[model samples]
Target: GVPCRCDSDGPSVHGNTLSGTVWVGSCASGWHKCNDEYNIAYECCKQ
Candidate 1:
């Protein structure tokens, strides 16, 4: 996995109907956040 490219997730779903600030985004493990919108972006970088 040497090809360092831009990878991202789907929608940053809600903070609704649950505990405080419960949310879900496509940003995965070992990936870093790169965007600032609902649909954020994650890179192929380390965690």
Candidate 2:
């Protein structure tokens, strides 16, 4: 896990540095990562 950030704008959407996870647009409670850099700027999921 590493430090991460999010550029999304909305509620329930946030960023995590430890697991490098972020919630963009509308996300579920699970592991998720973006392939393109143009997408979300985070990785991993919430437990």
Candidate 2 lDDT at 47 equals: 40
Using TM-score, give the best candidate's number.
1
Give me the overall lDDT of model 2.
0.41
For candidate 2, lDDT tens digit of each residue in 1-47? 44333443223645424334445553446654432342344343334
lDDT of 1: 0.33
Among all windows of 10 consecutive residues in model 2, the one with the lowest summed lDDT is: 2-11
Per-structure clash totals for the candidates: 0, 0
Residue-level error in angstroms, candidate 2, position 20 = 3.6
TM-score of 1: 0.24
- The global C-alpha lDDT for each of the candidates, from Candidate 1 onward, is 0.33, 0.41
